[PDB]
Design a protein around this ligand. Structure first.
Ligand code: 065
Ligand code: CL
Ligand code: CL
Ligand code: NA
Lengths: 99, 99
């Protein structure tokens, strides 16, 4: 699809068996999801943005379905105000910015 | 252009006759730039990101070139960690997300 940017580019995702709404975010290096359980091991990480940093749990090799497209990668879990799909997974679904 | 996301989507902007680097950010509602001088009056704004909220200076109707495309619109100035071009100006330059 072609998504214009008049409104936030929100899509439905499936992660850990859960359906969620997330933001397709070209400014995010990483994918960051609101607090939830995921299987497997994790390690702590700090990520920073406007407003400063938050502590997250880093889970590797997590499968996510993004608007119907499957991708695998690292997912950070923590107290983000919004679910964010970052470049690590946008690349896998073939997303580009066009103008 | 068609910009892939394997690297940060950084472009050159020109504002106040100065070149700067900025991130094309579909996750940003607004455009936020590091401390600089802009003409005219400003108004207060609070913006919220990953780490919390910050105060910024809102300048309206600012002329800004983005990757060679002319835009005229609102620029927020404050302690952002990177210059971010948000959807208010991405729509002016005709940008879409495609996958
Ligand atoms: C600030 C940029 C460089 C990074 N951020 C991604 C942004 O797209 C962020 C994504 C975001 C969106 C909403 C709330 C919090 C974060 N947007 C944002 O802060 O936009 C602000 C300016 O316009 C306003 O509209 C949205 C909030 C304001 S982020 O959320 O802090 C972030 C995400 C993944 C990350 C990361 C930081 O570090 C490593 O991987
Ligand atoms: Cl990854
Ligand atoms: Cl590619
Ligand atoms: Na894992």
């Amino acid at each position: 699809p072609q998504i214009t940017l008049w409104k936030r580019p929100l899509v439905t995702i499936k992660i850990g068996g859960q359906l969620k709404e997330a933001l397709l975010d070209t400014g995010a290096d990483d994918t960051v999801i609101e607090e939830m359980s995921l299987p497997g091991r994790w390690k702590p990480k700090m990520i920073g943005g406007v407003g400063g940093f938050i502590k997250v749990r880093q889970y590797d090799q997590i499968i996510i379905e993004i608007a119907g497209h499957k991708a695998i990668g690292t997912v950070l879990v923590g107290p983000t105000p919004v679910n964010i799909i970052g470049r690590n997974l946008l690349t896998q679904i073939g997303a580009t910015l066009n103008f």
